[PDB]
Amino acid sequence: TKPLWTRNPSDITQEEYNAFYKSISNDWEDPLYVKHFSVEGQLEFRAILFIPKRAPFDLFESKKKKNNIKLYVRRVFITDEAEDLIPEWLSFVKGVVDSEDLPLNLSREMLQQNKIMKVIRKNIVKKLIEAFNEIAEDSEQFEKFYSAFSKNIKLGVHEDTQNRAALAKLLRYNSTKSVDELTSLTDYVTRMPEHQKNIYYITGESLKAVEKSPFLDALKAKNFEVLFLTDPIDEYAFTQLKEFEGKTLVDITKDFELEETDEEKAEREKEIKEYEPLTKALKEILGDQVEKVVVSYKLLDAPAAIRTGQFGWSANMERIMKAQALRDSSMSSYMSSKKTFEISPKSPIIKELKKRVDEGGAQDKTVKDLTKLLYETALLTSGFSLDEPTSFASRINRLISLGLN
Amino acid sequence: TKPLWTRNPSDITQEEYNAFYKSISNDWEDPLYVKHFSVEGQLEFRAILFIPKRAPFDLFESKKKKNNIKLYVRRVFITDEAEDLIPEWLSFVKGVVDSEDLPLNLSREMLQQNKIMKVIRKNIVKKLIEAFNEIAEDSEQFEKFYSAFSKNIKLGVHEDTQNRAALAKLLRYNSTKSVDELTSLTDYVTRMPEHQKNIYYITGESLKAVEKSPFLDALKAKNFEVLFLTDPIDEYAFTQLKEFEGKTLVDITKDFELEETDEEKAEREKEIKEYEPLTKALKEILGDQVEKVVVSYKLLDAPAAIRTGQFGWSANMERIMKAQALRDSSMSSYMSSKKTFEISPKSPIIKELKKRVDEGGAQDKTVKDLTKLLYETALLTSGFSLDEPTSFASRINRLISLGLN
Amino acid sequence: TKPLWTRNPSDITQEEYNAFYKSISNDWEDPLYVKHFSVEGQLEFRAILFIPKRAPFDLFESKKKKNNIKLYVRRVFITDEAEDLIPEWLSFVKGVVDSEDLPLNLSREMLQQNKIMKVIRKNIVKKLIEAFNEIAEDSEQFEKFYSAFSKNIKLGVHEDTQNRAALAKLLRYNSTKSVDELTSLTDYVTRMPEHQKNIYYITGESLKAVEKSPFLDALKAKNFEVLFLTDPIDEYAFTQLKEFEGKTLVDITKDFELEETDEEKAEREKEIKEYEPLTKALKEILGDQVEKVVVSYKLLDAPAAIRTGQFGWSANMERIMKAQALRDSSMSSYMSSKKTFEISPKSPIIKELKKRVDEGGAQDKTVKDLTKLLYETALLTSGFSLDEPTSFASRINRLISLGLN
Amino acid sequence: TKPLWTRNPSDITQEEYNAFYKSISNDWEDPLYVKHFSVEGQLEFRAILFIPKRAPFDLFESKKKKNNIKLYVRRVFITDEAEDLIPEWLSFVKGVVDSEDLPLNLSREMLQQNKIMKVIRKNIVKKLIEAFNEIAEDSEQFEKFYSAFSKNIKLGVHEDTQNRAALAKLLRYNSTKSVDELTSLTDYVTRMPEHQKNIYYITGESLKAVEKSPFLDALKAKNFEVLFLTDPIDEYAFTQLKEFEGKTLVDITKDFELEETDEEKAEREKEIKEYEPLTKALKEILGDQVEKVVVSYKLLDAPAAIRTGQFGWSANMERIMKAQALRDSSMSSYMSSKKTFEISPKSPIIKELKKRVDEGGAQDKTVKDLTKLLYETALLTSGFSLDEPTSFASRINRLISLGLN
Amino acid sequence: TKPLWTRNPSDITQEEYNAFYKSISNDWEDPLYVKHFSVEGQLEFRAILFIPKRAPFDLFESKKKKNNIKLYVRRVFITDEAEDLIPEWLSFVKGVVDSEDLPLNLSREMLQQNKIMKVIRKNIVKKLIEAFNEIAEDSEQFEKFYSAFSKNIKLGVHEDTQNRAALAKLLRYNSTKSVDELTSLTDYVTRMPEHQKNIYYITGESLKAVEKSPFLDALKAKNFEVLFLTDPIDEYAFTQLKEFEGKTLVDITKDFELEETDEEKAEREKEIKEYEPLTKALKEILGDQVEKVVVSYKLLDAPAAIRTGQFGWSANMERIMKAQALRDSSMSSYMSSKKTFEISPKSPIIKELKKRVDEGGAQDKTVKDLTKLLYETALLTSGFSLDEPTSFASRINRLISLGLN
């Protein structure tokens, strides 16, 4: 009679694992995948870890319990409340780990024991990634795995600094080039033309919301795929990954793409300069509400828009840090990010404002009102809340009337 | 020798209570007030309850522990985890209760015990309100009690159906007529002119936000005080109290006030009827985004506005239930309320829309666009988030050009 | 490949529910009944609740754990320690509830969430009663359901004010007219002749004890069914139900029935008045031990008896509140109850005492001793403990002593 | 600048101990007594234990927490949930123990450590009794110590087999010869005449009840002091102590005293034998309700009485085991105890029954009824509940009924 | 319907138990043995206890939870955290006990309840040993039971004073005559020759270590079996059992065996006396590091050795209590034992030291050094750590040179 985890995997039937899983898990369903391995070498252990079909609870929300993998040493049960055997992003994992080297009844002063635990843990994580990569091979199997554990995967990417890279490969999203189905980063990279330099994503409330972005039009025309990231960790993960091959970037932020077809690269400076005295003029109005006014070719068929600085929390994030101050009835402190007001010369509305400026109209109540209004609108369009009812109400009424009487 | 609480209050010094409080409380500070009483009659007990100067923790936020008043029976310590000895809205209270009648070691089947427990509690609560009424006598003393316990007071008003009425008297708020200082309901009531019928209030994010309400202008003109309630319970409480003498009402909801000068009462129907075919027309455009379009005289110098139905959670509340789904991606949906789109005939913008309708222009892209836009604006003005960037952006740009082009 | 509770009941097999139950329950046995339903409308949720064959534990006695139904929102596990999702009397219920509307991470200040909880609960209860009503259809199924959950049923009647009425229907008792088998209230109501006005029960220790009640004889003669209630909740439930069509009443309390075919109604006052000077006389002896001495026709072939006042806790309840003080070396009395000493003119023993009174023997040591003794006896007979050994011992030896020499 | 307990007691002031106590205790009051000692030798430790003025909680009742003495080793805090450092009956004790010898981080397999614990404990107990013995010196101090810790004292006697003997000394009771004031065992032993062989106690509900015992009269006449024990542990303790010099015995049980100045010793057998055919006769009636009928001279001026067998739980205990079954709608009997029905030949009532028996009246319905009734009465008198209402009611009415007509 | 444990064992199938076990245990495997019995008589209960195939956790190590046997009274679940229903040495046992006599809702003052609890437990234990005795019948079955529970068996022998004797019979060990296989005490006993008087054992680190003991040679030569006990409890158990037929004894302690050939018995005193002045001399050098120097015939072909006193913890135990202080820096000190320094006259090295002493060389630096060194070596040989590097190093280097220089 010998404990299941000491036996050889090729020599345990399913059913055995199934019952073992059941007895440890309170899951009525069989386990999605069973990873049963042994390490040898410097340190030695055996383990049977199980991947459930469905999340037994979820990280964030869903209360928060410690992992309950059965830690054994030298085949003797020690605890199922192991201190640092596995990271929070894998708390859903179930099973047994039987160490040969963990010391028993040693003062907590002896840190050799933590180090040993720390390399047992590191191994588990390796082996589990190896398992996910194996599940990935089966489309149906992975469908459920991802559907249940995406957020763990994402947190893994945020948290783990070694395995960050490999875990990325298990991420999956909708995109412009994958509307129904979910696409991989590796796939996204395949669809990249020879001259695309970066991987483009967009962050926002939901899929529905994120496609209406005015920011898309430009990349689309260029034929670049844009990924959709509608969950908050999505950002924390991405901003921490930094890159996959090319750098990964939100296009709701300070972008900078290509020779704008090298021809356009040429005539742009010619134009950008013509607009300079507008640039300065608009900034004189907006004052501090903005960091700077600029001309954008990354903006199609829309007068203006707002891009938060790169290296600073996205519009989508502000939206959340800020909806809070408007609930917490004490706070009004802001850690936020800098705003860049973009102007599209292609939009006749802009062409027109240039005209009035190139005609001494640098401080017309009319040109002031238009600017201001265009700005507030940008905030809306670019998914921001604006600045106060009054001001904005007023601005609009004064311009309906011109379109009426 | 004899336990402090058995002794006669007039015959225990301060310093004794003070050390008693300190030993039971982990408060470094002395207690704000000590209510030490004894009930006799049907049932008997003595108690000493303390009121802290500062909340030892807060309900909502601030974790959530069980009350720890030391329950004694016949001078024998039983527990400081009493089952229903005091309501959650008073969890902050501290001290000892010593019952003479509570039975020991009775099956939980014997409900007599709960009933006894229930009449001990009802009494505590009585005595405590008695205590707060006493503190109310001292301006400085109350200042701190209120400052710490206002929310308990409000939850009390929401929860307690008997003492609801009395607890109200302890509430305090800023108002139109009390800008810096807090005013009492009873006070507000004094401030009523003979013909005021109701007590006006307003729900909103903060004071700053709530004064910019366009809904104030009307009451101001009539001279009626409006109360400011910037906290969620403020509402759950008021909607539960229902009235203090007159009925209490948010003016962000379907109001109905005062004769309007009975003269105006007269010419109004004449006008309202004139507008009927506009009313229907605008509703035909808005479809289901609104419940109904109406003409308001409760709206001054502003084209349009939005009022949620009375008997439904305020705009201010939606703002909050809605901002949540926009943090939760297992969501998409909110407790909206019924929206009433209000039209001011005094605003020329409206006079004009009637003109175009009284001229077959019932389905002009121009009249459609203006309506739609006036509506979206109302949401902003009336403290709502709108419906989607796109639509809104578009509408404005066209207003700009076509009102300038 | 989708959580069991989101699937359609008609399309889940048994065996699936069975294993689901087993994984959630630690019951080695299958479930008694599985109610799997969905609510739509105002709010939305699906659930699968299970009814065990046998109480997993009992309320009262058997420790006391919080319910462990798995609360989900939007298909995401939140907790199995739900705040107020199900009432105590149903704590034995097991399974899953998946709300669509419950908000996550909202301040506890937001009471909307409790309200939503409150309606989710109310529904569960509805559906649950629904299920019992369905189990009620099967005799053998119900037998076990009742045998296990009767006390829950009873507490529910006591507790729930809405469903009280329907829950009654599920109660079941022995009665005078149902000696072996259990009868329903609805049944009892059938067996009621046209002129029976109330529903009659009796409260006492056990069945064996409760049949020997002298109080039955009068109802029997009248051919009125009496129910037997030998459990304490039985009472708390009854006294809370108040009625079923007619008022429900203990006949160990202040009754008042009929008119004795009305003939007896006539001659009674004639007789009652004859006994008046006895009445007053016996009361002069008993003093305060009694509230009043009266003549009863509700008492057959027994000299005297004792009825607690109606609107006051039954003899059976006192027996319990009082057996406690006699374990607490600290309690002196409690509530007790007002006692009414009943005299039967048909018993020769009484006829005789009248004789001695109608002969100046108002204060005979002999007449005193007989009264006192008759009284103590009534306490025994009417299921009470008496007053002190001494006094009673003495009385008997003498009424043996004079009874011979 | 060194931990208080390592310092020399003669060199710590009060005020220091007081604050130390207060920091460790949450008692607003100072300690009653502080025992601060050190052991050296085989093993070594220092301690400061405190005795409260008033029970911080009570054993039995009052929940039940583990002791929270601060266990230190080598001046390093280890825990305040010590494994077996102090016995339950002392759980109220507060302070610090600092062992020099307890091993840290040793497998639980190493029982040496428990042994060391075991002797540390045994010592504490020694020193503690030492302290009580010291409090015993001060009347007022002891008054409060006893008033608070009597039950601990009693449990200790029950529990501790070594210190049982000394702990007795600290007990205190009312007695026949000490009516107001409390007397010690050692005192009682003084008041014992040369020929008194045993120490006599009685067990019952309260003082008031226990004095009306018919069992006292015999000891009184003999001029033997009887102690009053009105608490249940009193018994468990006594029956466990067994003796103090002479054997300690309940006189509600099978006694056997003296020789009645020996004269009575002579004429008794002559009489006992005369009654033999009555003896057998009454037993033929009572059947199994009794173990045996006997003639007692330990019973004055009362016809009959009931003594439970010695070596069996007292009447007082039954009263309790039995009041339980009568709350548990499930219990049938328990242990009970063998009953001995005692007859007093000095009571004319008995003399008479002999007469009817010595006249063929061995099976008279009249003689049956008297026996039975005398018996039931004995149960009441001797502090028992009887057998069924009916039977008893009936018996009385007739023995009223024939007692007149 | 009826709870499994109420049913008759001969009438419940396997599979029922098996599923019952599984539902209560979280063991994936079936139970090793199921003991299902019922007690009647004085007290009554039924039980089903299970024996696992493998330890569900281990005592010592392996955290430490309370036993979770489901306690029922009168077929009503009370708790699975029973107060003293089973001893710690059996905490691994699982199942249900259903008492008929345990009282519910009794003050904790009523110790009757503990007593009942105590006789339920005593019975369980009986039955369980009965079960182990049964398993003992099956070689393969026992193999696994022993393998899992040996330590419980041993703690049992240590703790349980009644069943001590029987539990012994279940112990198993390797020995000199059983090298691979485990042997029983009863077996060992068979292996005794007529004249063997005791049962020999040896305590040490492991088997490997314990066979290299120089203490074996003597017994081997005589042909006596020595048992190997490589676990700490092995000792705490044996020292508590004291004997099985003959007394049991570690031969690492003060032995005393067999006639030695009664011839040798004769010439020994003659010799021992010759050595007396050496004996004293060597002790004069060693001072307090030893208790006494003696001459041994229980020592073959080795100059000297060390035996701890009998009635004191073995060398093997010191090794352990000492290795701890050498991990603990709040220490310095250990439970040493008394050491006896043994001299073999057959070793020429000794013969020589006598020569130098019988020649005034009682205090030669040379004879001092040799003694000292022989001693330190004995500590090593006899499985002890020595006294300090320095001293020892030095001694050797001087031996090298001066034995070579």
Side-chain angles (χ1 to χ4, degrees), chain A residues 285-302:
Chain A
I285 304 169
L286 297 166
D288 262 26
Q289 299 192 252
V290 189
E291 178 74 19
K292 77 258 215 285
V293 186
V294 312
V295 161
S296 206
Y297 294 91
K298 295 167 289 183
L299 177 54
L300 320 185
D301 59 289

Side-chain angles (χ1 to χ4, degrees), chain B residues 42 58-64 74 83 88 100-113 115 151 155 158-159 231-234 236 313 317 320-321 324 328 330-331 335, chain C residues 58-64 73-74 76 83 88 100-112 115-116 151 155 158 231-233 236 313 317 320-321 324 328 330-331 334-335:
Chain B
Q42 195 74 73
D58 89 338
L59 25 43
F60 338 132
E61 277 46 89
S62 179
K63 184 66 225 55
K64 207 256 232 94
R74 262 101 51 202
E83 238 261 284
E88 168 153 0
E100 289 300 300
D101 322 283
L102 277 189
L104 296 182
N105 308 293
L106 255 190
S107 160
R108 219 145 22 81
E109 173 158 30
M110 296 314 300
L111 315 166
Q112 52 166 312
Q113 60 198 125
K115 316 288 191 34
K151 346 160 62 25
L155 199 253
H158 175 90
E159 290 287 308
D231 302 298
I233 45 149
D234 282 335
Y236 295 99
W313 286 293
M317 206 78 96
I320 299 168
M321 316 176 285
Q324 250 298 135
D328 199 350
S330 72
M331 252 319 187
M335 201 143 85
Chain C
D58 89 349
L59 21 44
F60 342 128
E61 272 54 88
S62 171
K63 189 63 229 48
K64 205 256 227 91
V73 358
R74 263 98 53 201
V76 188
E83 251 259 289
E88 177 156 346
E100 286 296 298
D101 318 286
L102 274 183
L104 300 175
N105 311 293
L106 240 194
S107 158
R108 222 140 28 77
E109 169 160 20
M110 289 323 284
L111 304 180
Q112 58 165 312
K115 316 287 188 35
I116 289 152
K151 348 159 61 25
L155 195 257
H158 172 87
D231 299 306
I233 27 160
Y236 294 99
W313 287 291
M317 205 77 96
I320 302 165
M321 313 185 271
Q324 249 299 132
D328 261 283
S330 45
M331 294 212 255
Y334 21 82
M335 194 280 110

Side-chain angles (χ1 to χ4, degrees), chain C residues 2-222:
Chain C
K2 210 185 72 210
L4 192 78
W5 61 100
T6 63
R7 296 160 57 189
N8 183 315
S10 52
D11 177 61
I12 291 140
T13 75
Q14 212 68 185
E15 259 44 86
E16 268 161 312
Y17 286 117
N18 282 203
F20 179 80
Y21 172 70
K22 240 213 201 44
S23 83
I24 262 324
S25 68
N26 317 293
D27 178 354
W28 68 288
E29 232 157 18
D30 295 323
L32 172 70
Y33 189 97
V34 20
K35 225 276 174 323
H36 172 196
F37 62 91
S38 85
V39 191
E40 334 202 299
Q42 197 75 77
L43 269 51
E44 305 197 329
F45 69 100
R46 306 185 122 258
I48 299 164
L49 312 176
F50 298 96
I51 310 316
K53 316 215 143 149
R54 274 209 260 277
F57 55 90
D58 89 349
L59 21 44
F60 342 128
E61 272 54 88
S62 171
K63 189 63 229 48
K64 205 256 227 91
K65 301 297 142 86
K66 38 173 76 149
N67 178 71
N68 63 307
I69 287 187
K70 297 209 145 347
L71 176 59
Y72 278 77
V73 358
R74 263 98 53 201
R75 294 143 135 264
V76 188
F77 175 70
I78 295 313
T79 160
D80 81 338
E81 298 182 312
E83 251 259 289
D84 312 306
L85 169 86
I86 215 187
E88 177 156 346
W89 60 272
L90 280 161
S91 74
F92 64 85
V93 174
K94 289 194 159 29
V96 261
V97 168
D98 190 351
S99 164
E100 286 296 298
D101 318 286
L102 274 183
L104 300 175
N105 311 293
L106 240 194
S107 158
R108 222 140 28 77
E109 169 160 20
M110 289 323 284
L111 304 180
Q112 58 165 312
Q113 55 192 128
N114 299 270
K115 316 287 188 35
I116 289 152
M117 195 72 274
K118 194 197 165 162
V119 332
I120 290 164
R121 160 168 20 91
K122 272 168 46 185
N123 277 256
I124 312 281
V125 186
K126 213 196 131 332
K127 288 285 167 192
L128 273 170
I129 290 173
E130 181 162 301
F132 310 155
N133 278 333
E134 169 100 81
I135 295 182
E137 270 162 46
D138 183 329
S139 90
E140 293 173 30
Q141 223 68 190
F142 190 89
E143 196 189 51
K144 32 268 273 315
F145 174 90
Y146 200 69
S147 174
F149 298 114
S150 65
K151 348 159 61 25
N152 297 86
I153 297 314
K154 287 157 166 164
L155 195 257
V157 176
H158 172 87
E159 291 287 300
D160 186 321
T161 170
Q162 280 230 88
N163 303 304
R164 185 164 287 149
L167 285 168
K169 265 160 187 73
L170 289 163
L171 298 154
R172 224 111 307 192
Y173 292 118
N174 296 295
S175 79
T176 41
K177 286 164 185 189
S178 207
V179 160
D180 158 314
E181 255 274 40
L182 288 184
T183 192
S184 52
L185 290 166
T186 325
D187 281 8
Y188 177 107
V189 159
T190 285
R191 303 178 212 106
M192 288 198 265
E194 263 40 308
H195 58 296
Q196 206 186 317
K197 241 271 171 195
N198 302 312
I199 295 174
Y200 293 103
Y201 68 97
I202 173 149
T203 50
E205 217 95 85
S206 69
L207 197 127
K208 304 184 75 172
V210 109
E211 303 173 329
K212 318 172 186 295
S213 178
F215 292 120
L216 289 171
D217 315 52
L219 280 283
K220 291 172 140 289
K222 224 82 204 281

Side-chain angles (χ1 to χ4, degrees), chain E residues 212-257:
Chain E
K212 315 176 187 297
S213 186
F215 291 123
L216 279 166
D217 316 47
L219 277 288
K220 300 172 128 286
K222 219 86 204 285
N223 205 249
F224 293 151
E225 194 179 0
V226 186
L227 281 158
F228 307 138
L229 327 189
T230 75
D231 302 298
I233 45 149
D234 282 335
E235 190 174 335
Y236 295 99
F238 270 38
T239 76
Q240 188 67 36
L241 213 198
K242 280 195 186 289
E243 49 163 68
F244 186 88
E245 272 16 287
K247 313 135 164 99
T248 48
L249 49 158
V250 218
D251 56 338
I252 79 173
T253 45
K254 215 129 267 37
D255 224 82
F256 168 81
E257 184 68 287

Side-chain angles (χ1 to χ4, degrees), chain D residues 7-21:
Chain D
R7 296 160 57 189
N8 183 315
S10 52
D11 177 61
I12 291 140
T13 75
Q14 212 68 185
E15 259 44 86
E16 268 161 312
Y17 286 117
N18 282 203
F20 179 80
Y21 172 70

Side-chain angles (χ1 to χ4, degrees), chain D residues 63 74 108 112 321 324, chain E residues 63 104 108 321 330:
Chain D
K63 189 63 229 48
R74 263 98 53 201
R108 222 140 28 77
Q112 58 165 312
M321 313 185 271
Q324 249 299 132
Chain E
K63 184 66 225 55
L104 296 182
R108 219 145 22 81
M321 316 176 285
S330 72

Side-chain angles (χ1 to χ4, degrees), chain B residues 289 372 375-376 379 385-389 391-392:
Chain B
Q289 305 190 253
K372 188 277 181 171
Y375 176 65
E376 295 265 57
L379 298 165
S385 85
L386 50 149
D387 299 282
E388 318 323 281
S391 17
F392 193 61

Side-chain angles (χ1 to χ4, degrees), chain A residues 346-353 355-357:
Chain A
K346 286 300 144 78
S347 274
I349 314 94
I350 278 68
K351 297 184 196 284
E352 176 50 68
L353 278 162
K355 300 302 91 200
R356 303 218 181 173
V357 154

